[PDB]
Design an enzyme around this catalytic site. Structure first.
Site, PDB file in Angstrom:
ATOM      1  N   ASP A  38      37.281  30.735  34.650  1.00 24.54           N
ATOM      2  CA  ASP A  38      37.867  32.048  34.418  1.00 24.54           C
ATOM      3  C   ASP A  38      36.837  32.989  33.797  1.00 24.54           C
ATOM      4  O   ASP A  38      36.601  32.943  32.598  1.00 24.54           O
ATOM      5  CB  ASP A  38      39.072  31.910  33.485  1.00 24.54           C
ATOM      6  N   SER A  81      32.497  50.183  40.079  1.00 25.38           N
ATOM      7  CA  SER A  81      32.401  50.319  41.517  1.00 25.38           C
ATOM      8  C   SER A  81      32.183  51.786  41.874  1.00 25.38           C
ATOM      9  O   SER A  81      32.666  52.690  41.193  1.00 25.38           O
ATOM     10  CB  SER A  81      33.673  49.774  42.173  1.00 25.38           C
TER      11      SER A  81
END
Length: 330
Positions: free
Chosen positions: A35, A199
């Site tokens: 994770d 992004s």
């Protein structure tokens, strides 16, 4: 040193991925959920409340000649999906894919929430976010990666998740045969303890690319892609019959649909998520309403590039002095 381990989807939807991990002496192999959005290595154990164990493999520290109680240390964690676990702490030898760390904090669960009990395939979590998020008190502990880093050939790990197929976690090297083209690296903020990056935009299907900054985290422990409501609405508007359902808890679409791809930007590069990756199947067994793999982050407080996004790429988690993230197509 290096390590290399195969990671395998737990079910037919790729809800999560499990990777075998050796703990203790002699080795006890547990299948852990790696994770990159958390920083605790915790396991089902001989200390876990018996009624909360249902099929998991447990770690038994009393059977490990290298286990030592970390006296006074406790831990307690809550995840974004509302699940939780807590307990006490041992140090022991932990190996992943041939890479060994001695003195790793292994957090032994005394209690786990229902979602963990109900998932017989996941024996615990191995956190790979920054150690500043580790929950051990009163002495915070380091992640497996942080402990291994100095010994690695290169201070990196890579995630190469499969779509309905096994993939690979590598430590200490970049497998140049595992991706196509070049790797595009992008800046990371560690201020919130995550692999947080920005992004450069998105496209829906064959549509034009929209240049827009989207801050989010690379999180292998989250199944879906969670993005701003504007972006998500633009995606689902291209699917006939798709709608947001408050009763179901997100966007659903007719199971008869063919989903468009979704592209996200990494600098000037582009990663394309095929439409099929965005199908999470019937909302309930036999239903003709299907659950979407792109959902709104509104009210989470952070955008999350979960497995839906990451499995479309070869992803480099660069833990050099200034961390960065790399993405390549594959």
């Amino acid at each position: 040193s290096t390590g290399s381990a195969t990671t395998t989807p737990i079910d037919s939807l790729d809800d999560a991925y499990i990777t075998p991990v050796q703990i203790g002496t002699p080795a006890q192999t547990l299948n852990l959920d790696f994770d990159t959005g958390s920083s605790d290595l915790w396991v089902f154990s001989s200390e876990t409340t018996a009624s909360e164990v249902d099929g998991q493999t447990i770690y038994t520290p009393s059977k490990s000649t290298t286990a030592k109680l970390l006296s006074g240390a406790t831990w307690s964690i809550s995840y974004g999906d509302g699940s939780s676990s807590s307990g006490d702490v041992y140090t022991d030898t932990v190996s992943v894919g041939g890479l060994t760390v001695t003195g790793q904090a292994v957090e032994s669960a005394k209690k786990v929430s229902s979602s963990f009990t109900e998932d017989s395939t996941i024996d615990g979590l191995l956190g790979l976010a920054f150690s500043t998020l580790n929950t051990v008190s009163p002495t915070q502990q380091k992640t497996f990666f942080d402990n291994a880093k100095a010994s690695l050939d290169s201070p990196v790990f890579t995630a190469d998740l499969g779509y309905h197929a096994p993939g690979t976690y590598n430590f200490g090297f970049i497998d140049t045969t595992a991706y196509t083209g070049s790797i595009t690296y992008t800046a990371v903020s560690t201020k919130q303890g995550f692999w947080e990056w920005t992004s450069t935009g998105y496209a829906v299907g064959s549509g034009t690319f929209k240049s827009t900054s989207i801050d989010g985290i690379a999180d292998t422990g989250t199944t879906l892609l969670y993005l701003p409501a504007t972006v998500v609405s633009a995606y689902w508007a291209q699917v006939s019959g798709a709608k947001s359902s408050s009763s179901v808890g997100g966007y659903v679409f007719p199971c008869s649909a063919t989903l468009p791809s979704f592209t996200f930007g990494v600098g000037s590069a582009r990663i394309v998520i095929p439409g099929d990756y965005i199908d999470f199947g019937p909302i309930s067994t036999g239903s003709s309403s299907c659950f979407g793999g792109i959902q709104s982050s509104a009210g989470i407080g952070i955008n999350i590039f979960g497995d839906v996004a990451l499995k479309a790429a070869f992803v480099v988690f660069n833990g050099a002095t200034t961390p960065t993230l790399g993405f390549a197509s594959k």
